[PDB]
């Protein structure tokens, strides 16, 4: 470097290029990869970590522990990207997408540091990701019988093998079969909003449950609210968005008035205005008053004098559940409260759950949502228990958009290694490398899952490539038995979408990561 | 090791003496550095427009006093700065300039504020410099153009590092537009003098 | 006897910060290198074997690409040499929209050589003289090697061919998909009259499934939700609004007065009723889907779903603007219903979620319209700011392509017949400028040359086999990517053509920045100072 | 931290032998750039304005600071390689750093390390079973043209490569020179005999090899003659000074009469005995000691050149060469002091030439033994240097060449063989110590894949080229002459390097095998690492 | 194990922890040395105090009631 008297750009610009930033970019994946590494399979641990407030999150999602990296490295940010992108598109795999993008760039770094065209390495994984794809939507098992109840054990068992490597796995079968219900009550479009999720401390896992309506924490009583009765055996609910209090009638409202008679006409004027709301909700027939707006001690002390319920400053997301579940329609004014606009509901009450009240509307048979609630020992207990329902839910929910399923344990993907390896065998040779490199790489999981685990990944690897050799294609690891089994007759089943998915994701990265040849970093600002 | 309940009891009653003896001089150190924080840290460590009245406003700013042009007063000591920020009516407004000789942008600006003081004779512009004041080495390498703001007793400008949007060639004019976009400048030639009991006058009685 | 005083004159008076470079080997010289420098960086991402670079930013922004304006842009330049340059291929981006590293790889070589010609004897003068009279011959020459034409803009298969070649060089590995998608979008934009607009192709980066799963949509895409419970409509019949869905408001000072108790009894009621007739009277022209660009009120809302009536809230005034020109609709300033021709009609709007991200799509059944979008997905946000820089690509081309129909032959082969004509050229004209006329057609030989070493092969056999083949007569054959020794074939017959226009542009720029630069004699440099932005 | 309590960092697992990995790597990477005829030289500036440029691996690794462990284990592991054979350094060091690599890419696959370790050792016992039984060529068969095409090989990759035309020659007939033989019949060859003087100037091609000796140094005084024609050197390890009585010895003085005559002894003594010297015919004298102004006077009236502070291996070298004895004291076993005639050295001529602004003596044609030199001419000094280090490299090899009889084909062509045979072997010893060989046998392909990458040439197609023929050679009983087939880097094709005249000794690739071997052996059995905190 | 005395610290900074004996310790003296300062003012023969407060008011309060001496002091 001659140091020219004026320099090109600015000085602390910083210039890495050729084979060595490359190498450097392959062990930052590599790094990146081996910190949710131990985060796979039913003898995945949990990472536990700590921000600079202090507050720590305790986690087996691998996407959720890559986000809380403060990742800088940009070719190591593509791996917390693509595992953002496995869990927005399809919500589990998040994992796998990281370890087999690592162990792509990993298989071909031997050929990179000998001065291989990465354009030839990209073209090679490609074609690898293709075929690889496509064998995967051909060897897919699916049930074309539209059977009820064969679609429910369907569900289960993606359910249950989805939720297979978290705190709440030994009682898999419980959370599998209420994420089931809580899905096939959505109608169409499966949103996520439509499933409440409820964390009250203190209660063991078993103690969660799921009601077939909504359920919301009791939001700030006013005077006069114990007076109001807490069991309904048949309300009408009147979804509001209304303030029921004394308060000026308009923010730019002002009253001109010259006599003491007309002072106390306004005043009674102001008293019949409210009044008069609380007699048309009163007079609408429902029992049970929900506003989105405070619900003032007066409208709480007239209902309970009725002996009706009130509950203000509800949150939106609630009466959109409540509304879904009940029946009803979010009204802004009461002048027109007909029967077609109020909630009914078969039972409405208030119960202590944990040291906190909590609002109960169930018996709703016609209830397009659900509310789960959910019971710990601990806040970040009850957020892992939290994440791994919405993975399960969203497993479910990709099952019922198309139901065709691969067996677990890494069966999938030895299968697909050996037919990559066949194809292999049959082309001139440089292109053949490269793709045994790809089909090498795809045993990760399956080793994963054994070193995880403790076992001999090598004899469990040896056994499984021999079996696929000989014939079998759903055969995997099977963990308790230290062996390898029949993963599709032990119901170890995931989604197609969740394998394809991952494969296009880290094969993406990999070439995006290969394809860099220089990284420039400007002075910060 | 006991007698966590020490109860010091006839000590300080005879040795209150020193102890004030040294509060005295430590709570002249504190309210030296109270005083000195209030600019630090918290922004230190981090064709109309064509103006053809301004030429006008510097030629009759040229042509500003007759007698004198009159220096920036000088504060010699942190003590000094002290008393005449804590003196003077609370009705006026004094701004103080830090400087280090040396840095450019300093002479430019003192004449801006010599100009500023000729023709408005309310203000009381003073300079300080940045060494007698012992800011930190960031306030001297990278704070040169420090214009605070007494109104009062509070600062209701704390202008710091006015280079940039004020250039290193300003003028009077363009220093008093600049403090004027905020409303920091509040809005005859005597022969000589006209000023010179209480008894007035009186006729007969 | 220890030190050398400055020289009386100028050098004393000179500032403190400032710097003054003078004469031809502290200026000329080093303006020449900085330039050599910035081309030798952007080199490396010339041609479809380019390789990205990593550029980050002042603000932490991650910029992986091979686009040259990209990197030149997001690379924070300070030698004014090189900043005149970066201008020029900026020039050139906003006038077509493709081959800024072919201006700056142009740019540098000819510095290159005029550097080479001032050091054996020549002058500047002579230089720029032969540098001129070499591109008006090279202008001259240009539109005699129009190998083919566009010859139909409405067909899709045509227009898919002639726009592969703009987005291969990037994206190299798969081009014909995104070849195919852009030809659709293009085509559906592109009425009977001859006027294309760029601005008429949106894109929608939407994360999550790689980019196979890109397609293309006759209509608009808002990442947005409904203000409604209403999700989803079949025979759209769009009201927008410029004003925001409440009750129009004094602007000086609305101040309500009561004086009776029956007014403040009726106030609310009043209001309500009246907004309830306004929302009412919209629904009754038959509109279901209502647009407006501000607020929504509450009741308004509440009203609004009593009506059914699908709700769209578009913060942006752009947004709002293209809703009307791709549904036909008027933007009314006030709240009255809309007349028949004001009322926009879209064949379907509904509320989707792709991904994970909620969208409302306002989609036509007809291959046609005034706006056309791209959804791109994908597993990487960096990955689909790549995809979307080469969908501006291939728009550019398409409109160079309305603009021109002319194409020239790619791959290395024009800039081969143009430097070996201008040689030519060069041996019959006698004097001083001959030596600047041959080293400008031999500077055409740094985009072989590039293309060579970014394929991985000896450019130095591509450029004597390319010379041996031009000197038999076949000019339209350029090297040839797929193989691993160094190898050339036609061009015409592969389909790898670029625009007679652009390149001719970028012939123009680059010239005229080389000449620019080397026009400068002295440079007196101010103190840097501050500044930020 | 935590309940062990010490004073320093602790790191165990995968984490350390990632550490010591990456180390072994980093020291690899350094000097993988200047391996292989395409390889270029380095410079390295001392921080203070040394400048030196050299290719040398060896070199290289002792001039850089190194503070990891393992680094510095590989740095020593050069040093070794460099003291014992001379040569492949840079090979040895990229070797080991390659198996540790791969060895640890196999633990990392829950390996255990022993297994490693046993399968190495097999595999580097194999590997020099089949080089001493299959790949070596006897040097019989060729006579001198085998000395000159290893000396030559060695030339390549070094600063004096294209001259190697006349550079192997220089040596090898400098090797030749200094031959000798000893007890049990064993004709060795002491290099380091073979004095090289360092003298910018003129170009390389007139380097000259002096038939000779060649001193450092210059005549102690300037009326001395600069020129004998027939030389009687005596060699001296004493000096010629005033004699100064010693520590026990004490002069005092009671008779003033007496002081005079000690003062004249005091000098007449060296007199008496530089005349003895020179009474039998001695013309050039030699000393490792200083000389005193009156003895260069003495010396000067006789007509005889005098030599002071010499060097005692300098002087050695001499006396052996011309027959001399070297003398630390004039005593002989009858209690007097004389010098005899039968002690005195010959040669044919003895000049003070001059060589670039700097004088020197030549001492040509010493007779009873023949000695060599050599003085190397550069652009600048540090050209001569690397030329040094270069010329040293070629001596060794020569020298391990002519000791032993056997040679190998160089060019990646014994570790394409080594990798092909050890892949094909390890089906038949272990189950885990199957992978342990292999990985050994595709570390052993670390060396031609280094010299494709060094030329900028298509490394995977060119392996994969002398992979096939080496395959092709193991396989096929009538195609054994493959075996020689190896790495052309200037046209990138696989050649017949035994025909190409590329060798090396096979003692080279031999202990660069067990160096490296036993170097990541040593490093993989390491699992933990405390590094305690420094005293201050 | 305890708390403090354990390999792995279990506070934050300025945290402290007394086990029996220390705890103990601790408020035996505290207690002690309240009860020796309130007595000695106790009967008809009992003295009074001076109470001299270290504020700015310096505030001067000569009293014999043991629980105004024993809330005006600062007590740890
Ligand atoms: N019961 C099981 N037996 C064997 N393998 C399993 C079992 N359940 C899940 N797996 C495997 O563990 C892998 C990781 O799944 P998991 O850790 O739940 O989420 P992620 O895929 O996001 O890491 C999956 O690829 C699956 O094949
Ligand atoms: N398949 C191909 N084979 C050979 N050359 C090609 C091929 N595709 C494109 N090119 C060449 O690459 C050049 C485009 O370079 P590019 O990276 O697009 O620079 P820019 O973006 O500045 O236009 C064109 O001049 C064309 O001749
Ligand atoms: N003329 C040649 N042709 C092909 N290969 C050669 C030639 N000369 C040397 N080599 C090989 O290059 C390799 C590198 O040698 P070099 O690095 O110079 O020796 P050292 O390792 O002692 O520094 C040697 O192993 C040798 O086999
Ligand atoms: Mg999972
Ligand atoms: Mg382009
Ligand atoms: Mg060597």
């Known amino acids: 470097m001659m140091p020219t008297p004026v320099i090109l750009l600015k000085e602390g610009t910083d210039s890495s290029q050729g084979i060595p930033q490359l190498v450097s970019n392959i062990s930052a994946c590599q790094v990146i990869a081996e910190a949710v590494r131990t985060t796979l399979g039913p003898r995945g641990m949990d990472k536990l970590i700590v921000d600079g407030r202090g507050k720590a999150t305790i986690s087996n999602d691998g996407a959720t522990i890559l986000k809380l990296l403060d990742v800088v490295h940009p070719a190591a940010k593509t791996l917390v990207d693509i595992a953002k992108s496995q869990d927005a598109e399809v919500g589990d795999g998040t994992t796998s997408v990281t370890l087999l993008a690592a162990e792509f760039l990993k298989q071909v770094k031997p050929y990179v540091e000998e001065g291989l065209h990465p354009q030839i390495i990209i073209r090679a994984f490609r074609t690898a990701t293709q075929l690889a794809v496509n064998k995967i939507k051909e060897i897919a098992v699916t049930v074309k019988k539209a059977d009820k109840v064969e679609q429910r054990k369907l569900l289960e068992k993606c359910a249950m093998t989805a939720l297979s490597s978290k705190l709440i796995s030994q009682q898999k079968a419980f959370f599998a079969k209420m994420v089931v219900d809580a899905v096939m009550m959505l109608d169409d479009l499966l949103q996520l909003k439509m499933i409440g999720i409820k964390k009250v401390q203190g209660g063991a896992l078993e103690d969660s449950q799921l009601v077939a309506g909504v359920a919301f924490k009791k939001t700030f009583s006013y005077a006069g609210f114990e007076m109001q009765p807490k069991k309904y055996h048949n309300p009408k609910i009147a979804l509001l968005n209304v303030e029921l209090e004394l308060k000026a009638e308009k923010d730019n409202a002002e009253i001109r008035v010259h006599t003491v008679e007309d002072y106390q006409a306004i005043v009674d004027a102001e008293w019949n205005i409210l009044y008069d709301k609380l007699e048309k909700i009163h007079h609408s027939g429902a029992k049970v008053v929900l506003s989105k707006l405070p619900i003032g001690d007066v409208a709480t002390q007239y209902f309970a004098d009725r002996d009706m319920f009130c509950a203000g400053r509800v949150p939106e997301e609630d009466l959109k559940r409540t509304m879904m579940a009940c029946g009803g329609s979010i009204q802004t004014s009461v002048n027109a409260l007909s029967a077609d606009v109020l909630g009914r509901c078969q039972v409405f009450e208030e119960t202590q759950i944990g040291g906190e009240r909590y609002n109960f509307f169930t018996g709703c048979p016609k209830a397009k949502t659900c509310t789960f609630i959910l019971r710990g020992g601990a806040e970040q207990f009850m957020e892992e228990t939290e994440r791994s329902l919405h993975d399960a839910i969203m497993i479910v929910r990709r099952a019922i958009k198309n139901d065709s399923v691969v067996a677990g344990g890494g069966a999938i993907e030895m299968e697909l290694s050996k037919y990559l390896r066949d194809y292999s065998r049959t082309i001139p040779g440089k292109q053949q490398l490269l793709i045994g490199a790809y089909a090498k790489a795809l045993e990760i999981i399956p080793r994963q899952l054994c070193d995880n685990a403790g076992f001999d990944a090598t004899n469990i690897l040896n056994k499984l490539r021999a079996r696929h050799a000989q014939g079998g294609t759903w055969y995997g690891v099977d963990i308790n038995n230290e062996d390898i089994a029949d993963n599709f007759e032990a119901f170890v089943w995931e989604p197609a979408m969740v394998r394809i998915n991952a494969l296009t994701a880290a094969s993406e990265a990999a070439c995006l990561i290969v394809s860099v040849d220089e990284t420039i970093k400007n002075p910060r600002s | 090791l006991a007698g966590e309940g020490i109860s010091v009891n006839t000590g300080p009653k005879g040795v209150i003496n020193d102890w004030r003896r040294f509060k005295q001089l430590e709570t002249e150190q504190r309210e030296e550095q109270c005083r000195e924080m209030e600019r630090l840290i918290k922004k230190l460590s981090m064709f109309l427009q064509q103006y053809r009245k301004q030429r006008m406003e510097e030629m009759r700013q040229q042509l500003h006093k007759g007698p004198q042009f009159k220096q920036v007063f000088e504060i010699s000591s942190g003590e000094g700065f002290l008393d005449m920020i804590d003196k003077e009516q609370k009705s006026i407004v004094i701004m103080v300039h830090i400087y280090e000789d040396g840095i450019p942008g300093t002479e430019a600006m003192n004449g801006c504020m010599i100009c500023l003081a000729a023709e408005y004779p309310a203000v009381k512009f003073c300079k300080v410099k940045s060494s007698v004041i012992g800011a930190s080495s960031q306030f001297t390498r990278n704070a040169l153009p420090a214009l605070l703001i007494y109104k009062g007793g509070e600062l209701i400008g704390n202008f710091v590092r006015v280079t940039d949007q004020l250039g290193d060639d300003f003028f009077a004019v363009d220093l008093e537009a600049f403090l004027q976009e905020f409303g920091l400048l509040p809005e005859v030639l005597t022969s000589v003098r006209n000023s010179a009991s209480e008894d007035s006058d009186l006729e007969i009685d | 006897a220890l030190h050398v005083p400055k020289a009386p004159g100028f050098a004393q008076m000179l500032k403190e910060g400032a710097k003054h470079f003078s004469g031809l080997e502290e200026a000329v010289y080093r303006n020449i290198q900085a330039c050599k420098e910035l081309a030798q960086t952007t080199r490396t991402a010339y041609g479809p074997n380019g390789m990205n670079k990593m550029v980050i930013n002042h603000l932490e922004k991650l910029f992986v690409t091979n686009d040259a304006a990209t990197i030149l842009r997001e690379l924070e330049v300070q030698h004014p040499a090189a900043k005149m340059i970066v201008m020029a291929s900026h020039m050139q981006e906003q006038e077509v929209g493709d081959g800024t590293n072919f201006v700056l790889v142009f740019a540098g070589a000819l510095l290159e050589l005029a550097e080479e010609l001032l050091r054996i004897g020549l002058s500047v003068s002579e230089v720029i003289e032969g540098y001129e009279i070499a591109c008006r011959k090279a202008h001259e020459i240009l539109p005699n090697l129009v190998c083919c034409s566009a010859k139909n803009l409405r067909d899709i298969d045509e227009v898919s061919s002639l726009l592969r070649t703009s987005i291969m060089s990037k994206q190299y590995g798969n081009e014909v998909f995104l070849a195919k998608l852009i030809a659709q979008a293009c085509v559906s934009i592109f009425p009977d009259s001859g006027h294309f607009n760029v601005d008429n192709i949106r894109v929608c980066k939407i994360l999550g499934s790689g980019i196979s799963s890109s397609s293309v949509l006759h209509g608009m895409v808002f990442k947005k939700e409904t203000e409604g419970d209403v999700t989803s409509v079949k025979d759209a019949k769009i009201a927008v609004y410029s004003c925001p869905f409440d009750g129009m408001i004094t602007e000086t000072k609305g101040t309500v007065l009561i004086k009776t108790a029956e007014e403040l009894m009726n106030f609310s009621k009043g209001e309500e009723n009246l907004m309830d007739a306004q929302v009412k009277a919209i629904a009754d022209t038959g509109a279901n889907v209502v647009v407006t660009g501000g607020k929504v009120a509450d009741m308004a809302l509440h009203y609004a779903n009593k009506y059914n009536i699908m709700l769209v809230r578009l913060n942006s005034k752009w947004d709002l603007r293209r809703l009307c020109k791709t549904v036909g609709a008027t933007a009314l300033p006030r709240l009255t219903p809309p007349v028949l021709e004001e009322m926009g009609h879209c064949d379907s709007v509904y509320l989707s979620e792709v991904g994970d991200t909620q969208v409302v799509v306002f989609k036509h059944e007809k291959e046609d319209g005034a706006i056309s979008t791209i959804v791109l997905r994908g597993s990487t946000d960096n990955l689909m700011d790549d995809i979307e820089r080469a969908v501006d690509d291939g728009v550019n081309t398409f409109k160079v392509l309305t603009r021109d129909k002319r194409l020239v032959p790619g791959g290395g082969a024009t800039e081969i017949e143009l430097a070996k004509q201008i040689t030519s050229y060069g041996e019959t004209c006698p004097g001083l400028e001959q030596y600047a006329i041959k080293k400008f057609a031999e500077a055409f030989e740094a985009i072989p040359r590039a293309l060579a070493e970014n394929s991985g092969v000896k450019a130095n056999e591509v450029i004597s086999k390319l010379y041996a083949v031009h000197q038999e007569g076949n000019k339209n054959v350029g090297l040839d990517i797929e193989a691993e020794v160094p190898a050339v074939k036609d061009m015409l017959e592969a389909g790898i053509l670029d625009t007679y226009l652009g390149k001719y542009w970028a012939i123009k720029l680059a010239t005229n920045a080389a000449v620019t630069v080397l026009r400068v004699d002295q440079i007196i440099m101010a103190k840097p100072a501050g500044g930020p932005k | 931290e935590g309940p062990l309590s010490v004073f320093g960092d602790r790191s165990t697992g995968e984490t350390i032998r990632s550490q010591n990995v990456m180390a072994a790597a980093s020291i690899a990477n350094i000097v993988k750039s200047s391996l292989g005829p395409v390889g270029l030289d380095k410079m390295l500036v001392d921080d203070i304005g040394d400048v030196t440029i050299t290719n040398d691996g060896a070199t290289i690794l002792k001039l850089l600071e190194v503070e990891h462990p393992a680094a510095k284990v590989l740095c020593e592991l050069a040093d070794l390689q460099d003291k014992e054979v001379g040569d492949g350094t840079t090979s040895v060091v990229i070797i080991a750093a390659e198996l540790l690599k791969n060895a640890d890419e196999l633990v990392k696959q829950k390996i255990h390390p022993t297994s490693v370790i046993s399968g190495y050792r097999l595999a580097c016992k194999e590997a020099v079973r089949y080089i001493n039984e299959n790949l070596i060529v006897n040097t019989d068969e060729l006579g001198r043209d085998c000395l000159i095409n290893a000396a030559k090989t060695s030339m390549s990759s070094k600063i004096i490569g294209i001259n190697g035309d006349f550079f192997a020659n220089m040596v090898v007939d400098a090797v030749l020179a200094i031959k000798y033989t000893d007890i049990r019949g064993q004709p060795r060859y002491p290099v380091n005999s073979v004095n090289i003087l360092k003298a910018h100037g003129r170009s390389q091609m007139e380097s000259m090899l002096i038939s000779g000796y060649a001193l450092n140094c210059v005549v102690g005084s300037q009326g001395m003659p600069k020129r004998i024609v027939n030389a009687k050197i005596a060699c ?220 900028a040439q298509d490394s995977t197609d060119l392996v994969a080229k002398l992979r096939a023929f080496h395959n092709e050679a193991q396989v096929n009983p009538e195609r054994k002459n493959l075996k020689w087939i190896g790495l052309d880097l200037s046209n990138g094709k696989p050649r017949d390097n035994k025909q190409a005249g590329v060798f090396e000794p096979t003692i080279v690739k031999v202990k660069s095998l067990k160096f490296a071997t036993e170097a990541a052996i040593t490093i993989l059995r390491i699992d933990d690492l405390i590094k305690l905190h420094p005293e201050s | 194990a305890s708390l403090s005395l354990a390999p792995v610290n279990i506070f934050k900074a300025g945290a402290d922890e007394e086990r029996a004996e220390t705890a103990r310790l601790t408020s035996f003296i505290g207690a002690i040395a309240i009860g020796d300062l309130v007595k000695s003012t106790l009967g008809p023969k009992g003295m009074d105090k001076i109470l001299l407060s270290s504020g700015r008011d310096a505030s001067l309060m000569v009293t014999n009631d043991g629980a105004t001496i024993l809330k005006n002091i600062g007590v740890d």
Do not use: W
């Open chain 4, 236 to 455: 001296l390890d004493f000096s010629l000074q005033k004699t100064k009585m010693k520590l026990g010895v004490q002069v005092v003085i009671t008779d003033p009469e007496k002081l005079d005559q000690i003062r004249q002894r005091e000098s007449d003594i060296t007199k008496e005995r530089i005349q003895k010297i020179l009474a039998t015919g001695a013309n050039v004298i030699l000393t490792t000691g200083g000389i005193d102004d009156m003895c260069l006077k003495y010396f000067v009236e006789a007509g005889a050149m005098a030599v002071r502070r010499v060097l005692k291996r300098d002087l050695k070298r001499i006396a052996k060469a011309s027959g001399a004895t070297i003398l630390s004291t004039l005593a002989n076993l009858e209690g007097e002091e004389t010098f005899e005639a039968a002690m005195l050295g010959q040669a044919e001529e003895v000049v003070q030439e001059r060589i670039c602004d700097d004088e020197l003596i030549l001492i040509k044609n010493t007779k009873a033994r023949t000695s060599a030199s050599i003085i190397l001419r550069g652009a600048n000094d540090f050209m001569c240097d690397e030329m040094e280090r270069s010329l040293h490299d070629a001596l060794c090899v020569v020298k391990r060449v002519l000791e032993s009889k056997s040679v190998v084909p160089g060019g990646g062509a014994v570790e394409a063989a080594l990798s092909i045979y050890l892949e094909n072997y390890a089906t038949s010893m272990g189950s885990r110590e199957q992978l342990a060989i292999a990985e050994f046998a595709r570390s052993l392909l670390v060396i031609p894949n280094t010299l494709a990458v060094n030329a």
